[PDB]
Amino acid sequence: LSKALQCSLHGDTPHASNLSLALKYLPEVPDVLSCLELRYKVDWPLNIVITEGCSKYSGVFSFLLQLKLMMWALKDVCFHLKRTAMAGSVQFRQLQLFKHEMQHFVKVIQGYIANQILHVTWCEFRARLALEEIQRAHAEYLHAVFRGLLTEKAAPVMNVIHSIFSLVLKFRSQLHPNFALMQQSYNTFKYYSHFLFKVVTKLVNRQPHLEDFLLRINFNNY
Amino acid sequence: PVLLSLLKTSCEPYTRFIHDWVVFLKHIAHDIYVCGKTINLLKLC
């Protein structure tokens, strides 16, 4: 962390300190999980407002970090394949189209997160403020966890995301000795994605937040 | 008068408590509870 803040080009203030990069579990040993927290710290006249439970940032953080694990690992195979280039054949071009087909799904679910949890939920609670109200207004700003698909109500929508993230990690393992072993993997990816579009649609009749998701995942397709 | 002169002094110490943070209609009941804790919080800052 003390090496990270130097490369931030924004910070290194009294605010920038108090970033205890601690942990909460001891991992034993291809998955998409790496548990790790990141807790802010405050002092007395501010601790009375920012509750020691509003712990929920750590809930929304471990998701957002997990997302970066895709756009880096997927960037690796995009960079790992670059050095392979003479070698032009059907086995090659048909392989790279999988990456462009899998990357776009991550670059759209991220574009959603970068619209709900950082911009529109921040429009409120910024033009909303301008002593008891500060407790509730803050308890309504973060409650960012609803539009973030972390709520147990829309949990089945989140369970399917792991099946997507897992297959991309397997795609990174096989950095054409085993092409067919990868061809089966991509076909499993196109099925699960095609299943997501149905489970979200069926969950529209029962949440205006999810409405913008179908417009994101689907555009000139079915 | 006699009851008033009692009430006028039977509330003397209670005003002092009220003079720190600075049935009946509940529209002001819960407000007094917070109107004091703010003063007791600024005293430590």
CA atoms within 13 A on the CB side of A8: 12
Of A45, A131, A132, the CB nearest to B45: A45
| 3-state SS, residue A39 | strand
Quote the crossing angle between the two packed helices A90-115 and A155-173, to the nearest 10°. Answer: 150
Structure letter (DSSP) for residue A203: T
A43 interface with B at CB cutoff 8 Å: no
Q: Give strand pairing partners of A20.
A: A39
All residues of chain A having their beta carbon less than 8 Å from the beta carbon of residue B34 are 131-132
Resolution of the model in angstroms? 7.7
Please answer whether residues A78 and A99 qualify as being in contact, where contact means their C-beta atoms are separated by less than 8 angstroms.
yes
A residues 117-146 lying closer than 8 A (beta carbon) to B: 131-132
What the block records as the tokens of A134 is 């500060």
Q: How was this structure determined?
A: cryo-EM
In angstroms, the CA A91 to CA A112 distance is 34
Phi, psi (degrees; rounded to nearest 5) at A111: -60, -30
Handedness of CA A210, A71, A25, A11 (dihedral sign): negative
In angstroms, the CA A157 to CA A143 distance is 18
